[PDB]
Design a protein around this nucleic acid. Structure first.
Ligand SMILES: [Mg+2]
Ligand SMILES: [Mg+2]
Ligand code: NA
Length: 221
DNA sequence: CCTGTGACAAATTGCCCTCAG
DNA sequence: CTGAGGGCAATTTGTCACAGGT
């Protein structure tokens, strides 16, 4: 089963937001949104020991992952559409005791994490915790936004949108590099590392490729 | 314009080791 | 013991020249 992993549930506004976070920062961001989703002033807490347990890390590496990611949030903003930009943190994180980190999520991000009535993305945390490339995590979440109860779905993602919201590096505006370093890589991780089985076709307009059309089912069928 | 691939650079990985308390 | 440090080599991601229209 996967029912025992924490059910991550985020607004589509966040699934579609424009930002650049590392894998480690997105791993924590899941836990933050989960904490905020379960009650708020934006003040969340990471334990090194539980982070290590969740993500299959040693204490030392989980301490390292968390400390370095927390420092890297500074200067990072997230832009929400459907244009509004917010800093993720409004205070540096601090450790009030060994193994514990207190973080100050911008309380104006809370609605954007929670979202509207039925416009949300859900996945068990187990589905995303073995993905390594943060862009593959972005792709996974977008796919999950269109997932049906039976774990299947189909969605056309425009490439300029992917580039803008996932904030892909500039060289991936060259479509061969997009294919090789983003698309094939992230689809391979999802197939290798999640319960989702994913294929895609490219949509052309004249000489250009404009959209990637993703179709997926769950291994459980 | 478009494509894929080789080559190189930068980033990131899981590991390793030390040591304070 | 944990976890806050500093460190590593191998691997992956990010970039671009070049060759050719597959
Ligand atoms: Mg609180
Ligand atoms: Mg790490
Ligand atoms: Na790597």
């Amino acid at each position: 089963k996967r029912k025992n992993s924490p059910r991550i549930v985020q607004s589509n506004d966040l699934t579609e937001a424009a930002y650049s976070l590392s894998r480690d920062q997105k791993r924590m961001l899941y836990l933050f949104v989960d904490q905020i989703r379960k009650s708020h002033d934006g003040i969340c807490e990471i334990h090194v020991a539980k982070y290590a347990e969740i993500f299959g890390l040693t204490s030392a590496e989980a301490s390292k992952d968390i400390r370095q990611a927390l420092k890297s949030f500074a200067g990072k903003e997230v832009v929400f559409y459907r244009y509004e930009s917010f800093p993720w943190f409004i205070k540096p994180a601090h450790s009030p005791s060994r193994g514990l980190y207190s973080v100050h999520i911008n309380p104006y991000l809370i609605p954007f994490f929670i979202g509207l009535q039925n416009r949300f993305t859900q996945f068990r945390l187990s589905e995303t915790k073995e993905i390594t490339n943060p862009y593959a995590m972005r792709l996974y979440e977008s796919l999950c936004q269109y997932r049906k109860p039976d774990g299947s779905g189909i969605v056309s993602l425009k490439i300029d949108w992917i580039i803008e919201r996932y904030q892909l590096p500039q060289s991936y505006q060259r479509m061969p590099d997009f294919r090789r370093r983003f698309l094939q890589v992230c689809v391979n991780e999802i197939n290798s590392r999640t319960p989702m089985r994913l294929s895609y076709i490219e949509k052309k307009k004249g000489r250009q490729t404009t959209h990637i059309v993703f179709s997926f089912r769950d291994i459980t069928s």
